Amino acid sequence: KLVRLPGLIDVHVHLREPGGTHKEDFASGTAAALAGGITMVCAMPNTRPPIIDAPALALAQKLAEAGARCDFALFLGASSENAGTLGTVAGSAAGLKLYLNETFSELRLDSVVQWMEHFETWPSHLPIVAHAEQQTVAAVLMVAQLTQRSVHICHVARKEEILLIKAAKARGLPVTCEVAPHHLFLSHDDLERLGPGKGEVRPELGSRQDVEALWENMAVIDCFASDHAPHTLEEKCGSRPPPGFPGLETMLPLLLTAVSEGRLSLDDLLQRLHHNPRRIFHLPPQEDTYVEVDLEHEWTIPSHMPFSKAHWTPFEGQKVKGTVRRVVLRGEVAYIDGQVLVPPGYGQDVRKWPQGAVPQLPP
Amino acid sequence: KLVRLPGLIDVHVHLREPGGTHKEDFASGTAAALAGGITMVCAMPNTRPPIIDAPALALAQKLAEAGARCDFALFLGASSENAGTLGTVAGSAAGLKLYLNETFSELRLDSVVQWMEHFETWPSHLPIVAHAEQQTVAAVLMVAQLTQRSVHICHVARKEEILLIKAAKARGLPVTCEVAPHHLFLSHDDLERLGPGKGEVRPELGSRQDVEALWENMAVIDCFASDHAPHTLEEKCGSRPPPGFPGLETMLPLLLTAVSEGRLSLDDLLQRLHHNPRRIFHLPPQEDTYVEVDLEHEWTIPSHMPFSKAHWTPFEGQKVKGTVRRVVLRGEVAYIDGQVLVPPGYGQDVRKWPQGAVPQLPP
Numbered sequence: 001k002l003v004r005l006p007g008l009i010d011v012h013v014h015l016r017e018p019g020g021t022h023k024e025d026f027a028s029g030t031a032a033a034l035a036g037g038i039t040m041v042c043a044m045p046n047t048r049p050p051i052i053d054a055p056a057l058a059l060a061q062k063l064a065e066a067g068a069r070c071d072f073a074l075f076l077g078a079s080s081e082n083a084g085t086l087g088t089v090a091g092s093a094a095g096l097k098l099y100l101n102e103t104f105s106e107l108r109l110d111s112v113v114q115w116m117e118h119f120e121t122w123p124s125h126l127p128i129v130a131h132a133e134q135q136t137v138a139a140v141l142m143v144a145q146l147t148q149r150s151v152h153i154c155h156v157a158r159k160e161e162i163l164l165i166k167a168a169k170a171r172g173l174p175v176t177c178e179v180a181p182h183h184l185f186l187s188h189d190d191l192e193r194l195g196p197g198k199g200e201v202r203p204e205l206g207s208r209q210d211v212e213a214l215w216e217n218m219a220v221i222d223c224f225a226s227d228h229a230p231h232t233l234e235e236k237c238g239s240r241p242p243p244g245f246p247g248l249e250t251m252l253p254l255l256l257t258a259v260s261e262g263r264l265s266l267d268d269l270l271q272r273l274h275h276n277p278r279r280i281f282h283l284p285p286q287e288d289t290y291v292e293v294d295l296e297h298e299w300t301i302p303s304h305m306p307f308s309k310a311h312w313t314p315f316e317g318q319k320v321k322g323t324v325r326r327v328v329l330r331g332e333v334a335y336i337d338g339q340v341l342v343p344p345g346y347g348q349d350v351r352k353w354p355q356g357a358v359p360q361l362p363p
Numbered sequence: 364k365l366v367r368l369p370g371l372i373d374v375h376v377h378l379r380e381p382g383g384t385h386k387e388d389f390a391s392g393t394a395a396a397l398a399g400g401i402t403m404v405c406a407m408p409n410t411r412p413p414i415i416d417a418p419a420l421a422l423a424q425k426l427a428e429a430g431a432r433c434d435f436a437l438f439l440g441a442s443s444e445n446a447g448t449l450g451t452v453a454g455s456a457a458g459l460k461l462y463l464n465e466t467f468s469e470l471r472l473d474s475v476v477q478w479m480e481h482f483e484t485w486p487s488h489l490p491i492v493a494h495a496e497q498q499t500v501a502a503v504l505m506v507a508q509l510t511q512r513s514v515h516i517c518h519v520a521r522k523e524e525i526l527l528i529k530a531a532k533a534r535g536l537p538v539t540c541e542v543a544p545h546h547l548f549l550s551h552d553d554l555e556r557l558g559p560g561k562g563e564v565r566p567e568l569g570s571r572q573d574v575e576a577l578w579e580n581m582a583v584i585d586c587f588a589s590d591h592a593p594h595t596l597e598e599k600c601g602s603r604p605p606p607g608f609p610g611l612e613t614m615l616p617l618l619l620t621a622v623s624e625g626r627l628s629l630d631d632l633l634q635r636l637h638h639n640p641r642r643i644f645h646l647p648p649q650e651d652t653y654v655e656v657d658l659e660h661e662w663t664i665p666s667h668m669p670f671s672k673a674h675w676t677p678f679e680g681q682k683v684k685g686t687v688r689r690v691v692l693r694g695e696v697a698y699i700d701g702q703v704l705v706p707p708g709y710g711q712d713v714r715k716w717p718q719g720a721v722p723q724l725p726p
């Protein structure tokens with residue numbers, strides 16, 4: 001007996017096109033998404049060229065329309081030069097991404113004043129998300145308060161961070177957050193197995209206490225999002241390993257395993273992979289779209305999942321219970337038991353749908 | 364014709380006793396203070412042992428009462444273990460010091476949650492000051508807002524920092540700040556002369572643009588404070604140079620030079636070295652206390668000032684106009700033209716004076 005889920009949404013993926021297509025491209029990354037029960041993705045802007053201006057966004061839109069197999073929205077990225085220049089294209093993007101710490105990214109900002117400038121100039125009704133670790137969470141929250149608007153914190157990974165966000169929510173501040181599966185299912189205990197190259201990720205893997213704190217504070221977590229960050233094994237194991245894990249194909253099976261163990265409910269999962277992503281990012285419904293999962297099937301994660309070009313996974317060897325059997329996207333069978341059945345180009349930019357524009361007051 | 368100033372107050376000095384007395388002690392550091400026209404100092408807690416508990420404070424109080432030549436108050440320091448334990452001695456201290464970045468300091472905190480715990484437990488009516496650089500300024504401001512109280516930012520050194528504080532003040536937030544003379548009178552341009560050892564300080568020396576921004580935003584600066592941070596020349600020039608500059612003997616002459624050039628007014632100076640320190644830290648008046656200065660005397664700063672045991676200065680070679688001629692402290696001549704005339708032990712802990720207790724609601 002299969003369980004029918006709505007079309008799940010991942011608000012944090014790196015699809016590497018343009019410029020990093022040996023790691024992933026729209027076609028392979030969205031095949032990975034569908035195999036993971038994900039029908040809509042929001043793609044990050046740290047590509048080459050980075051998506052930090054109108055011409056780069058125009059290029060990315062066309063590459064995505066031609067290559068994507070599931071639906072999508074594209075983030076713009078904040079840079080040290082583009083505050084006040086994105087107004088005409090802002091509404092066409094998923095939101096604005098700020099890179100506020102060292103990571104795989106034309107996009108670290110030099111000064112909190114630059115953060116302020118982005119918060120002041122980006123349209124007030126549109127989403128802003130931040131890579132903001134440890135005290136940077138508190139710093140960007142301060143900027144959001146100074147500018148009287150909301151912020152969403154990407155990949156929360158630490159007890160320190162989730163407790164700070166919890167305190168902010170208790171004070172009624174408009175902040176939301178997401179957590180990635182590696183910060184719920186991996187920890188320092190796994191670094192010996194992974195090694196120092198494969199194990200590189202930002203935020204880094206946490207202690208047992210960090211992981212426990214995220215689970216204990218599930219009520220504070222608004223979304224799950226993979227931070228699918230594919231790099232090849234050669235890159236991960238070479239002399240300058242880039243940070244990041246692939247994750248689209250493993251996220252839902254890991255979380256279904258947790259549901260079957262009673263660690264969170266099916267509803268808790270669907271709030272975090274469907275309803276809250278919709279409402280925070282104003283993402284539209286997908287008509288005649290659903291995912292069928294088998295909650296009884298036990299399997300062990302292999303050394304690589306079938307679709308991501310990363311061709312490795314840090315979850316290798318973990319036992320999971322739960323699998324994606326079928327995905328229907330807008331009335332067409334998109335995935336069945338390991339076979340993707342929609343071509344590159346089937347996916348659409350949801351920000352172009354009438355129902356996908358973010359509502360705003362007449363300007 | 365001499366000009367009579369009130370007794371000036373330096374709210375940020377390191378006097379090194381206990382535990383670092385080759386660098387400075389209460390007797391030498393307060394001789395330096397008097398020679399710089401300073402009659403009251405607030406001593407930082409990063410000594411050995413650090414002043415992070417009641418027994419250490421008791422020791423420091425006695426060393427200061429026996430050695431100080433000018434009046435003083437002693438800071439307590441926040442640690443990873445002492446939140447919620449300082450309530451009985453808190454009112455006897457200048458305030459609580461938080462070290463939130465890497466510097467010469469049992470006292471970096473590991474987590475913003477520890478900052479929160481200090482803000483929640485330290486008595487709400489007593490001062491909190493923070494070493495908080497760059498985004499850390501925004502982070503500690505957020506903690507202050509979450510806990511509904513004020514904070515004072517030590518040694519502001521950058522355009523980024525002063526503009527963030529300016530924005531916070533424009534929003535009516537209870538934040539004050541101080542600036543040290545090296546961040547007004549030295550910059551990157553001086554690193555070639557100083558060398559990489561002598562030039563080590565936290566916050567580091569800024570660009571020309573940083574320095575210009577502090578002057579342009581003088582209205583945002585509540586206090587001047589030296590961050591007198593003596594280390595010997597051997598230490599500064601050795602294999603692991605500690606950060607910090609001595610500054611008590613040079614601060615007032617540097618600032619008087621600026622006054623004579625019309626860069627700020629005498630009143631601007633006295634607000635920042637007398638009235639604002641009094642009101643932010645609730646420091647009492649000193650009866651029959653004043654400083655006589657000669658604003659016409661031109662001289663060049665030598666390779667070391669007479670009193671600090673640091674026995675070096677980064678301002679060597681700078682031409683100044685203005686000198687301290689005489690200091691009277693509580694009715695006794697304390698300093699005349701290079702001679703200190705009050706003995707170690709003349710100085711008193713102002714927090715023990717009836718008028719030096721911080722007012723509070725009946726608890």
Ligand SMILES: NC(=O)N[C@@H](CC(=O)O)C(=O)O
Nearest residue numbers: 014103104201202229243244
């Ligand atoms: N998280 C990572 O380790 N890497 C991400 C960058 C990011 O999300 O910060 C990537 O794009 O490779």
Ligand SMILES: NC(=O)N[C@@H](CC(=O)O)C(=O)O
Nearest residue numbers: 377466467564565592606607
């Ligand atoms: N500022 C410095 O460079 N050093 C100070 C420490 C401090 O004020 O942060 C010291 O105590 O030596």
Ligand SMILES: [Zn+2]
Nearest residue numbers: 103131154202
């Ligand atoms: Zn990130």
Ligand SMILES: [Zn+2]
Nearest residue numbers: 012129154155
């Ligand atoms: Zn994110």
Ligand SMILES: [Zn+2]
Nearest residue numbers: 012044227229
């Ligand atoms: Zn990412």
Ligand SMILES: [Zn+2]
Nearest residue numbers: 466494517565
């Ligand atoms: Zn400091």
Ligand SMILES: [Zn+2]
Nearest residue numbers: 375492517518
């Ligand atoms: Zn200070």
Ligand SMILES: [Zn+2]
Nearest residue numbers: 375407590592
């Ligand atoms: Zn200091």
